[PDB]
Amino acid sequence: GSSRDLFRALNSFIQTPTLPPPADLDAIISSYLERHDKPEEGSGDRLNDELLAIWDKAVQDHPEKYAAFVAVLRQLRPGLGAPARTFQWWDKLLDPVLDNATREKGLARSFMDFTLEILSSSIPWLNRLLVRWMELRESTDLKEQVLTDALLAFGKKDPKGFMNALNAFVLRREHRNSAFSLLCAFVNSGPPHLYLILQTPLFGNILQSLQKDESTFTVNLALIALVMLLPFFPGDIVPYLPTLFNIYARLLFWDRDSYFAQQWDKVLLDPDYDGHSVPYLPEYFTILYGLYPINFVDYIRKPIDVHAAEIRERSERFRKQHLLHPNFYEYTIETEKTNITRWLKSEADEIIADCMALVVQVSLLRYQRHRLLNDLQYERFVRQQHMSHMGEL
Amino acid sequence: SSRDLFRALNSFIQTPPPADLDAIISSYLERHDKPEEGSGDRLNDELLAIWDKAVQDHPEKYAAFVAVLRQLRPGLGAPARTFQWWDKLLDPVLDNATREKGLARSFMDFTLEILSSSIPWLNRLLVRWMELRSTDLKEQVLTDALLAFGKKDPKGFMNALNAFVLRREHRNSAFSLLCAFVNSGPPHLYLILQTPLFGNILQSLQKDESTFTVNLALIALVMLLPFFPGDIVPYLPTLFNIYARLLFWDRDSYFAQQHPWDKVLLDPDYDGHSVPYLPEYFTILYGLYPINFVDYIRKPHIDVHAAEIRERSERFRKQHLLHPNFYEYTIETEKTNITRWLKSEADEIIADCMALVVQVSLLRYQRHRLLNDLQYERFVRQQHMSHMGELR
C-alpha cells in the first residue's frame, strides 16, 4: 500500500461497490495514511487529482455510488493536506447530497458523519448553508433534516459567526420569520457561549423587530427567541432593560398596535392570519420579574397617568401569578443592577429554575419548545398554502 | 285596676305568675307616665323591703322576684335604680345559677331587656371575672355580660381592661377577654387608638417574656389592625420591631436567662420557643404596608443579625404573592396616600389581604375555637401547677 495499490484498490471497489466497505480497503487506506507523514507537499496534490479523476470518470453520474465515495472520502479525509481542499470537496458534494438525499439510502447519514468528523478534528460555509436553506424553504424532508443538522453543527462550532450571518437575513424582510425560526431552533440545540450574541448585531435587531414590526407571527418568533436568550446573559442586559420594558408595554397593548395599522424594512400586518394577542407574552413577564423585579415594577408604576393605569390593569393578571421576589429582601433598584454575585453563582439552567419557582428537569422544557416550533412551522405552512389558493378566483 | 301593686306583690311572694298579676303590672306601667319624680323610688324601696323581709332566705322565690323585677324594670325611673338592682342581684344569681332552674336564663333575659333599653358595671364584672380565675356557667354569664356591655360602649370597655393589662396577675386574662371582645364584632374599634390600651399591647409585645402572654397580644393585634389600618403609620417601626422580636422568639426566651412596666416572666413549664400566630402577623403586615415591610426586612433598625432576619423571613416570602402596592405607590406615598382606606371596611381589607395567601363567619368561628382551646390549655396549666407543690 503506497499509491499504485491505492489506485487499484479504489478502482476495484468502484467496479463492485457495496455499502459496508471491506476490511482490506480500510487496511490499504490505513497503510497509506501511516506510510505518508506530510502529504502537504506533492502527495496531497496527486491524491486530490486522483479523487477528482475518480469523481469525473466513475462517480459524477452515478448517485447510488455517492455514499460509497463519501465513505471513502471519510477514510481519505486525513490525507488531502490543506484544509481548503476539504472545503473544496465538501462544497463540491453539498448539492449532489441535497439533490439525492431522499432517494439514496444512507447518503444523508454518511454525509452528516463526514461533516461531524470534519468539525471534530483539530463564514463561507455558513452563508452557503443559509442561502440554500432559504431557497429550499418556500411536512419535513431529508433535505431539510440535512440542512438543519448541519446548521446546528456549524453554529455549535462558531456561535458568534452563526448569529452574525443570520443577522444579514434578519435585515431582509422575506427571511426574517425563517431567520427567527432558525434562531429559536439554534437556541433550542443548547450551544455554548451564547453570550457572544452581545458581541454581534443580532440582539439589537431582535429588539428592533420587537419594537417596530407589526406582524404577530414575526413579533411572536422574536419574543420566543428573546425569552430563550435572556437566561444566558442576565447580568449584561442592564443597558437594554428600558427597551425590554418598553417592549413588554408594546406587546401589552398589541390589541391596539394591530389596530393602528389603518392606512429598517418593516413587516406589515397581515389582517388575514395575525391574531390580536401575543401568546408568549406571559412567559416574558416571568423572566423580567425573575431577573430584575424592582426595576420592572418601578417601570410599571412610573413609565399619561391614564395610559399608565391601563398598563397596571393589564399587568394585574400577571401580578397575581408570581410570588414575592427574594430581591425585595436584599437589593435596591440600584444594587439590583450593580450586584452581580447572583450571576456568578448560577448558570442558565439554575436561573431558569429559580424563575419558574416564582410561577404559581429541563429536558421537559426543551421538548416542549421543540413541539412549539413544530406547531409554528405547521401554522406557517397552513398560512402559505391558504395564500396560494385565495386569489386564484 | 292599678294602685295596689304592693298588696299584690306581698300577697304573691308571701305564701308561673297568674295572668292578673302581669295584667295589673302592665296597666300600672301604662297609666304611670313619669315615675322619675318619686313613684319609682317608693317602688324600689318597697321591692327592697320585700327582698329583705320575704325573699332573702327563700331561694325558690329568687326566680319569681327576678321575673317581677324584669316586668317592673321600665317603671323604676332613674338608671341608677336599675344599676342598684343589678348590682344587688349579681352575686345571689351567680351563687344560685346552678341550683335554681331557669334562674340563669331568666337573668339572661333581664340582661337582654337591659341591652334593648336606651364603668362601674364593667369594673364589677371585671373584678369578679378575675376572682373566678372545664367550663363554668358563672364565667359564661360574666363573659357574655362583659361582651354585651363592650358591644354597647367599646371605648369605655377597653378602657377598664387597660387597667388589668397593667397588672401582671391579670394580663393573660385581660388579653383573653380582649380577644373575645374583638371576636364579638363590636363597632368603632378604632377608638382603641384614642386610649392607652394599644400602646400597652405593643409594650407587652416588646417587653413581656411569657410566650403565652405575647402570643395572646399578637392574636389581639392581628384581630385589631384591619379595623384602623390607615392610622398605624406612626406605629409601623414598632410593629416591625415586634415582628423581628417574635422572629427570634427561640432566642429571646433563651436570652431571658440573666434578666414602670410590670413584666410577665417566662413560665419554664409550658411556654414554647416559637409564636404560633407569627405567620398571620406577617400576612397582615404584608397586606397593609408591603413596601415599608420589605424595606424594614432588607435594612433593619448587626449585618449578621439582619441576614438572620432575612433567612427567617424567606419562608414567609414563599407564601405571599407580589403586592399591588408595588405597581402604584412609593415607600412614601404608601404612608401618604389614604384613598385605599376611605371606602374600605375592615372585612374588605381582610378579604383583600387573604388574596395574598397561597366569607367572615368562618373566620370568627375559627377564632372562637382557638380562644376556647387557649382557655382550656390555661385550665390544664393551672391544674398542673397546683399539684406540683402538694408533694412538698
PDB file of N, CA, C and O in Angstrom, chain B residues 309-364:
ATOM      1  N   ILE B 309     -32.490  37.761  60.036  1.00  0.00           N
ATOM      2  CA  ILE B 309     -33.883  38.182  59.862  1.00  0.00           C
ATOM      3  C   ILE B 309     -34.354  37.822  58.460  1.00  0.00           C
ATOM      4  O   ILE B 309     -35.471  37.329  58.266  1.00  0.00           O
ATOM      5  N   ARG B 310     -33.492  38.043  57.467  1.00  0.00           N
ATOM      6  CA  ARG B 310     -33.810  37.707  56.082  1.00  0.00           C
ATOM      7  C   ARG B 310     -34.038  36.206  55.929  1.00  0.00           C
ATOM      8  O   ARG B 310     -35.024  35.765  55.314  1.00  0.00           O
ATOM      9  N   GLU B 311     -33.123  35.405  56.485  1.00  0.00           N
ATOM     10  CA  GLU B 311     -33.199  33.960  56.321  1.00  0.00           C
ATOM     11  C   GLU B 311     -34.471  33.413  56.950  1.00  0.00           C
ATOM     12  O   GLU B 311     -35.082  32.482  56.415  1.00  0.00           O
ATOM     13  N   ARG B 312     -34.899  33.987  58.082  1.00  0.00           N
ATOM     14  CA  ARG B 312     -36.152  33.521  58.666  1.00  0.00           C
ATOM     15  C   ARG B 312     -37.387  34.117  57.997  1.00  0.00           C
ATOM     16  O   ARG B 312     -38.471  33.532  58.108  1.00  0.00           O
ATOM     17  N   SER B 313     -37.263  35.251  57.297  1.00  0.00           N
ATOM     18  CA  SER B 313     -38.419  35.759  56.569  1.00  0.00           C
ATOM     19  C   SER B 313     -38.588  35.114  55.199  1.00  0.00           C
ATOM     20  O   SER B 313     -39.619  35.334  54.548  1.00  0.00           O
ATOM     21  N   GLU B 314     -37.607  34.319  54.765  1.00  0.00           N
ATOM     22  CA  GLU B 314     -37.685  33.688  53.447  1.00  0.00           C
ATOM     23  C   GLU B 314     -38.885  32.744  53.361  1.00  0.00           C
ATOM     24  O   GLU B 314     -39.587  32.690  52.337  1.00  0.00           O
ATOM     25  N   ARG B 315     -39.133  31.993  54.443  1.00  0.00           N
ATOM     26  CA  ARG B 315     -40.205  31.002  54.465  1.00  0.00           C
ATOM     27  C   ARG B 315     -41.575  31.661  54.389  1.00  0.00           C
ATOM     28  O   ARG B 315     -42.518  31.071  53.850  1.00  0.00           O
ATOM     29  N   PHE B 316     -41.701  32.882  54.913  1.00  0.00           N
ATOM     30  CA  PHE B 316     -42.942  33.630  54.781  1.00  0.00           C
ATOM     31  C   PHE B 316     -43.041  34.274  53.406  1.00  0.00           C
ATOM     32  O   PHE B 316     -44.145  34.413  52.868  1.00  0.00           O
ATOM     33  N   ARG B 317     -41.899  34.670  52.835  1.00  0.00           N
ATOM     34  CA  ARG B 317     -41.886  35.221  51.483  1.00  0.00           C
ATOM     35  C   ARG B 317     -42.425  34.220  50.473  1.00  0.00           C
ATOM     36  O   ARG B 317     -43.191  34.581  49.573  1.00  0.00           O
ATOM     37  N   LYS B 318     -42.055  32.949  50.620  1.00  0.00           N
ATOM     38  CA  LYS B 318     -42.537  31.956  49.660  1.00  0.00           C
ATOM     39  C   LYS B 318     -44.030  31.646  49.787  1.00  0.00           C
ATOM     40  O   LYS B 318     -44.522  30.795  49.040  1.00  0.00           O
ATOM     41  N   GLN B 319     -44.765  32.302  50.685  1.00  0.00           N
ATOM     42  CA  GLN B 319     -46.196  32.073  50.843  1.00  0.00           C
ATOM     43  C   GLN B 319     -47.070  33.221  50.344  1.00  0.00           C
ATOM     44  O   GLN B 319     -48.300  33.109  50.403  1.00  0.00           O
ATOM     45  N   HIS B 320     -46.488  34.314  49.855  1.00  0.00           N
ATOM     46  CA  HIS B 320     -47.255  35.512  49.535  1.00  0.00           C
ATOM     47  C   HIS B 320     -46.938  35.999  48.128  1.00  0.00           C
ATOM     48  O   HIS B 320     -45.775  36.053  47.720  1.00  0.00           O
ATOM     49  N   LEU B 321     -47.994  36.357  47.397  1.00  0.00           N
ATOM     50  CA  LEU B 321     -47.866  36.931  46.068  1.00  0.00           C
ATOM     51  C   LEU B 321     -47.325  38.354  46.139  1.00  0.00           C
ATOM     52  O   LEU B 321     -47.339  39.002  47.186  1.00  0.00           O
ATOM     53  N   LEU B 322     -46.853  38.837  44.990  1.00  0.00           N
ATOM     54  CA  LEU B 322     -46.448  40.232  44.859  1.00  0.00           C
ATOM     55  C   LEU B 322     -47.623  41.158  45.140  1.00  0.00           C
ATOM     56  O   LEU B 322     -48.721  40.967  44.610  1.00  0.00           O
ATOM     57  N   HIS B 323     -47.385  42.167  45.978  1.00  0.00           N
ATOM     58  CA  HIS B 323     -48.451  43.062  46.412  1.00  0.00           C
ATOM     59  C   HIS B 323     -48.729  44.131  45.356  1.00  0.00           C
ATOM     60  O   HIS B 323     -47.795  44.659  44.749  1.00  0.00           O
ATOM     61  N   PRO B 324     -50.007  44.464  45.129  1.00  0.00           N
ATOM     62  CA  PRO B 324     -50.349  45.513  44.149  1.00  0.00           C
ATOM     63  C   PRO B 324     -49.779  46.887  44.465  1.00  0.00           C
ATOM     64  O   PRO B 324     -49.653  47.706  43.544  1.00  0.00           O
ATOM     65  N   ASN B 325     -49.417  47.167  45.723  1.00  0.00           N
ATOM     66  CA  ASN B 325     -48.842  48.469  46.053  1.00  0.00           C
ATOM     67  C   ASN B 325     -47.578  48.734  45.252  1.00  0.00           C
ATOM     68  O   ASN B 325     -47.252  49.893  44.975  1.00  0.00           O
ATOM     69  N   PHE B 326     -46.857  47.678  44.873  1.00  0.00           N
ATOM     70  CA  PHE B 326     -45.636  47.822  44.091  1.00  0.00           C
ATOM     71  C   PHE B 326     -45.887  48.334  42.679  1.00  0.00           C
ATOM     72  O   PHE B 326     -44.930  48.758  42.022  1.00  0.00           O
ATOM     73  N   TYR B 327     -47.132  48.329  42.198  1.00  0.00           N
ATOM     74  CA  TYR B 327     -47.436  48.948  40.915  1.00  0.00           C
ATOM     75  C   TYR B 327     -47.954  50.372  41.051  1.00  0.00           C
ATOM     76  O   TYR B 327     -48.200  51.020  40.032  1.00  0.00           O
ATOM     77  N   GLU B 328     -48.093  50.886  42.270  1.00  0.00           N
ATOM     78  CA  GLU B 328     -48.905  52.081  42.482  1.00  0.00           C
ATOM     79  C   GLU B 328     -48.282  53.118  43.403  1.00  0.00           C
ATOM     80  O   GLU B 328     -48.525  54.312  43.203  1.00  0.00           O
ATOM     81  N   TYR B 329     -47.495  52.720  44.396  1.00  0.00           N
ATOM     82  CA  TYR B 329     -47.041  53.630  45.429  1.00  0.00           C
ATOM     83  C   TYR B 329     -45.532  53.523  45.589  1.00  0.00           C
ATOM     84  O   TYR B 329     -44.908  52.529  45.210  1.00  0.00           O
ATOM     85  N   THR B 330     -44.956  54.571  46.161  1.00  0.00           N
ATOM     86  CA  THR B 330     -43.604  54.534  46.687  1.00  0.00           C
ATOM     87  C   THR B 330     -43.661  54.227  48.179  1.00  0.00           C
ATOM     88  O   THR B 330     -44.733  54.077  48.767  1.00  0.00           O
ATOM     89  N   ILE B 331     -42.486  54.132  48.805  1.00  0.00           N
ATOM     90  CA  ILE B 331     -42.453  53.910  50.244  1.00  0.00           C
ATOM     91  C   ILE B 331     -43.029  55.115  50.983  1.00  0.00           C
ATOM     92  O   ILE B 331     -43.508  54.977  52.115  1.00  0.00           O
ATOM     93  N   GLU B 332     -43.016  56.294  50.356  1.00  0.00           N
ATOM     94  CA  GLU B 332     -43.589  57.496  50.955  1.00  0.00           C
ATOM     95  C   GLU B 332     -45.100  57.519  50.764  1.00  0.00           C
ATOM     96  O   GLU B 332     -45.855  57.648  51.734  1.00  0.00           O
ATOM     97  N   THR B 333     -45.559  57.393  49.514  1.00  0.00           N
ATOM     98  CA  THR B 333     -46.985  57.505  49.223  1.00  0.00           C
ATOM     99  C   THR B 333     -47.773  56.338  49.795  1.00  0.00           C
ATOM    100  O   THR B 333     -48.987  56.467  49.985  1.00  0.00           O
ATOM    101  N   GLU B 334     -47.120  55.202  50.068  1.00  0.00           N
ATOM    102  CA  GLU B 334     -47.812  54.121  50.759  1.00  0.00           C
ATOM    103  C   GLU B 334     -48.316  54.607  52.113  1.00  0.00           C
ATOM    104  O   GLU B 334     -49.419  54.252  52.540  1.00  0.00           O
ATOM    105  N   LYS B 335     -47.519  55.434  52.795  1.00  0.00           N
ATOM    106  CA  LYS B 335     -47.937  56.042  54.052  1.00  0.00           C
ATOM    107  C   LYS B 335     -48.781  57.292  53.818  1.00  0.00           C
ATOM    108  O   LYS B 335     -49.615  57.643  54.659  1.00  0.00           O
ATOM    109  N   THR B 336     -48.579  57.966  52.685  1.00  0.00           N
ATOM    110  CA  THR B 336     -49.195  59.262  52.417  1.00  0.00           C
ATOM    111  C   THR B 336     -50.554  59.158  51.724  1.00  0.00           C
ATOM    112  O   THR B 336     -51.471  59.917  52.059  1.00  0.00           O
ATOM    113  N   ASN B 337     -50.722  58.219  50.794  1.00  0.00           N
ATOM    114  CA  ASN B 337     -51.983  58.097  50.070  1.00  0.00           C
ATOM    115  C   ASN B 337     -52.973  57.307  50.923  1.00  0.00           C
ATOM    116  O   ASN B 337     -52.706  56.156  51.287  1.00  0.00           O
ATOM    117  N   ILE B 338     -54.115  57.920  51.231  1.00  0.00           N
ATOM    118  CA  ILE B 338     -55.104  57.333  52.128  1.00  0.00           C
ATOM    119  C   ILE B 338     -56.380  56.917  51.402  1.00  0.00           C
ATOM    120  O   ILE B 338     -57.342  56.496  52.053  1.00  0.00           O
ATOM    121  N   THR B 339     -56.422  57.022  50.070  1.00  0.00           N
ATOM    122  CA  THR B 339     -57.618  56.608  49.336  1.00  0.00           C
ATOM    123  C   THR B 339     -57.971  55.140  49.556  1.00  0.00           C
ATOM    124  O   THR B 339     -59.159  54.795  49.579  1.00  0.00           O
ATOM    125  N   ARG B 340     -56.971  54.263  49.716  1.00  0.00           N
ATOM    126  CA  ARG B 340     -57.255  52.853  49.990  1.00  0.00           C
ATOM    127  C   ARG B 340     -58.244  52.667  51.131  1.00  0.00           C
ATOM    128  O   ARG B 340     -59.128  51.805  51.065  1.00  0.00           O
ATOM    129  N   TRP B 341     -58.125  53.479  52.176  1.00  0.00           N
ATOM    130  CA  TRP B 341     -58.883  53.243  53.395  1.00  0.00           C
ATOM    131  C   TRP B 341     -60.205  53.996  53.456  1.00  0.00           C
ATOM    132  O   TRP B 341     -61.016  53.700  54.340  1.00  0.00           O
ATOM    133  N   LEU B 342     -60.446  54.955  52.557  1.00  0.00           N
ATOM    134  CA  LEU B 342     -61.654  55.767  52.667  1.00  0.00           C
ATOM    135  C   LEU B 342     -62.898  54.912  52.469  1.00  0.00           C
ATOM    136  O   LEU B 342     -63.786  54.874  53.327  1.00  0.00           O
ATOM    137  N   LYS B 343     -62.976  54.205  51.340  1.00  0.00           N
ATOM    138  CA  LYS B 343     -64.165  53.420  51.040  1.00  0.00           C
ATOM    139  C   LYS B 343     -64.135  52.040  51.679  1.00  0.00           C
ATOM    140  O   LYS B 343     -65.179  51.381  51.743  1.00  0.00           O
ATOM    141  N   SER B 344     -62.977  51.598  52.160  1.00  0.00           N
ATOM    142  CA  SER B 344     -62.782  50.209  52.552  1.00  0.00           C
ATOM    143  C   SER B 344     -63.217  49.983  53.992  1.00  0.00           C
ATOM    144  O   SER B 344     -62.985  50.827  54.862  1.00  0.00           O
ATOM    145  N   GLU B 345     -63.848  48.843  54.239  1.00  0.00           N
ATOM    146  CA  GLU B 345     -64.158  48.430  55.596  1.00  0.00           C
ATOM    147  C   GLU B 345     -63.170  47.361  56.054  1.00  0.00           C
ATOM    148  O   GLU B 345     -62.348  46.868  55.278  1.00  0.00           O
ATOM    149  N   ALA B 346     -63.256  47.015  57.342  1.00  0.00           N
ATOM    150  CA  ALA B 346     -62.327  46.049  57.921  1.00  0.00           C
ATOM    151  C   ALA B 346     -62.410  44.700  57.216  1.00  0.00           C
ATOM    152  O   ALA B 346     -61.385  44.114  56.848  1.00  0.00           O
ATOM    153  N   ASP B 347     -63.633  44.202  57.004  1.00  0.00           N
ATOM    154  CA  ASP B 347     -63.818  42.895  56.377  1.00  0.00           C
ATOM    155  C   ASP B 347     -63.330  42.880  54.931  1.00  0.00           C
ATOM    156  O   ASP B 347     -62.768  41.874  54.480  1.00  0.00           O
ATOM    157  N   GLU B 348     -63.445  44.007  54.222  1.00  0.00           N
ATOM    158  CA  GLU B 348     -62.950  44.061  52.850  1.00  0.00           C
ATOM    159  C   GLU B 348     -61.430  44.036  52.844  1.00  0.00           C
ATOM    160  O   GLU B 348     -60.818  43.367  52.005  1.00  0.00           O
ATOM    161  N   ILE B 349     -60.811  44.769  53.769  1.00  0.00           N
ATOM    162  CA  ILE B 349     -59.355  44.804  53.858  1.00  0.00           C
ATOM    163  C   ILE B 349     -58.824  43.419  54.213  1.00  0.00           C
ATOM    164  O   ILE B 349     -57.816  42.965  53.659  1.00  0.00           O
ATOM    165  N   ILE B 350     -59.509  42.718  55.124  1.00  0.00           N
ATOM    166  CA  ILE B 350     -59.103  41.359  55.485  1.00  0.00           C
ATOM    167  C   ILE B 350     -59.210  40.440  54.276  1.00  0.00           C
ATOM    168  O   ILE B 350     -58.292  39.663  53.986  1.00  0.00           O
ATOM    169  N   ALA B 351     -60.333  40.514  53.551  1.00  0.00           N
ATOM    170  CA  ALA B 351     -60.511  39.657  52.382  1.00  0.00           C
ATOM    171  C   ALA B 351     -59.444  39.933  51.328  1.00  0.00           C
ATOM    172  O   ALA B 351     -58.874  39.000  50.750  1.00  0.00           O
ATOM    173  N   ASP B 352     -59.146  41.215  51.083  1.00  0.00           N
ATOM    174  CA  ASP B 352     -58.107  41.581  50.124  1.00  0.00           C
ATOM    175  C   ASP B 352     -56.732  41.092  50.565  1.00  0.00           C
ATOM    176  O   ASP B 352     -55.921  40.671  49.731  1.00  0.00           O
ATOM    177  N   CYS B 353     -56.445  41.138  51.871  1.00  0.00           N
ATOM    178  CA  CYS B 353     -55.165  40.628  52.354  1.00  0.00           C
ATOM    179  C   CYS B 353     -55.062  39.120  52.182  1.00  0.00           C
ATOM    180  O   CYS B 353     -53.960  38.590  52.006  1.00  0.00           O
ATOM    181  N   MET B 354     -56.193  38.422  52.212  1.00  0.00           N
ATOM    182  CA  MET B 354     -56.217  36.968  52.130  1.00  0.00           C
ATOM    183  C   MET B 354     -56.167  36.522  50.667  1.00  0.00           C
ATOM    184  O   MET B 354     -56.192  35.334  50.360  1.00  0.00           O
ATOM    185  N   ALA B 355     -56.122  37.499  49.761  1.00  0.00           N
ATOM    186  CA  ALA B 355     -55.850  37.230  48.356  1.00  0.00           C
ATOM    187  C   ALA B 355     -54.377  36.952  48.101  1.00  0.00           C
ATOM    188  O   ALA B 355     -54.031  36.440  47.030  1.00  0.00           O
ATOM    189  N   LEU B 356     -53.518  37.274  49.066  1.00  0.00           N
ATOM    190  CA  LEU B 356     -52.086  37.034  49.008  1.00  0.00           C
ATOM    191  C   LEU B 356     -51.683  35.656  49.519  1.00  0.00           C
ATOM    192  O   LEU B 356     -50.529  35.258  49.322  1.00  0.00           O
ATOM    193  N   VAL B 357     -52.585  34.918  50.165  1.00  0.00           N
ATOM    194  CA  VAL B 357     -52.227  33.652  50.795  1.00  0.00           C
ATOM    195  C   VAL B 357     -52.362  32.545  49.757  1.00  0.00           C
ATOM    196  O   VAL B 357     -53.359  32.471  49.029  1.00  0.00           O
ATOM    197  N   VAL B 358     -51.328  31.720  49.645  1.00  0.00           N
ATOM    198  CA  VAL B 358     -51.343  30.593  48.724  1.00  0.00           C
ATOM    199  C   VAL B 358     -51.787  29.316  49.420  1.00  0.00           C
ATOM    200  O   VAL B 358     -52.334  28.414  48.788  1.00  0.00           O
ATOM    201  N   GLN B 359     -68.269  34.971  54.167  1.00  0.00           N
ATOM    202  CA  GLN B 359     -66.822  34.966  53.986  1.00  0.00           C
ATOM    203  C   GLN B 359     -66.128  35.448  55.251  1.00  0.00           C
ATOM    204  O   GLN B 359     -64.900  35.544  55.306  1.00  0.00           O
ATOM    205  N   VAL B 360     -66.929  35.735  56.272  1.00  0.00           N
ATOM    206  CA  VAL B 360     -66.428  36.312  57.513  1.00  0.00           C
ATOM    207  C   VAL B 360     -66.808  35.404  58.675  1.00  0.00           C
ATOM    208  O   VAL B 360     -66.065  35.282  59.657  1.00  0.00           O
ATOM    209  N   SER B 361     -67.960  34.738  58.546  1.00  0.00           N
ATOM    210  CA  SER B 361     -68.444  33.829  59.582  1.00  0.00           C
ATOM    211  C   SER B 361     -67.414  32.759  59.931  1.00  0.00           C
ATOM    212  O   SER B 361     -67.190  32.462  61.111  1.00  0.00           O
ATOM    213  N   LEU B 362     -66.774  32.172  58.914  1.00  0.00           N
ATOM    214  CA  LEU B 362     -65.819  31.095  59.156  1.00  0.00           C
ATOM    215  C   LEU B 362     -64.618  31.598  59.952  1.00  0.00           C
ATOM    216  O   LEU B 362     -64.103  30.891  60.829  1.00  0.00           O
ATOM    217  N   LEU B 363     -64.166  32.820  59.662  1.00  0.00           N
ATOM    218  CA  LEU B 363     -63.046  33.411  60.389  1.00  0.00           C
ATOM    219  C   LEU B 363     -63.379  33.572  61.868  1.00  0.00           C
ATOM    220  O   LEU B 363     -62.620  33.130  62.741  1.00  0.00           O
ATOM    221  N   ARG B 364     -64.514  34.216  62.164  1.00  0.00           N
ATOM    222  CA  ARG B 364     -64.960  34.382  63.545  1.00  0.00           C
ATOM    223  C   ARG B 364     -65.096  33.037  64.249  1.00  0.00           C
ATOM    224  O   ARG B 364     -64.719  32.897  65.420  1.00  0.00           O
TER     225      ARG B 364
END
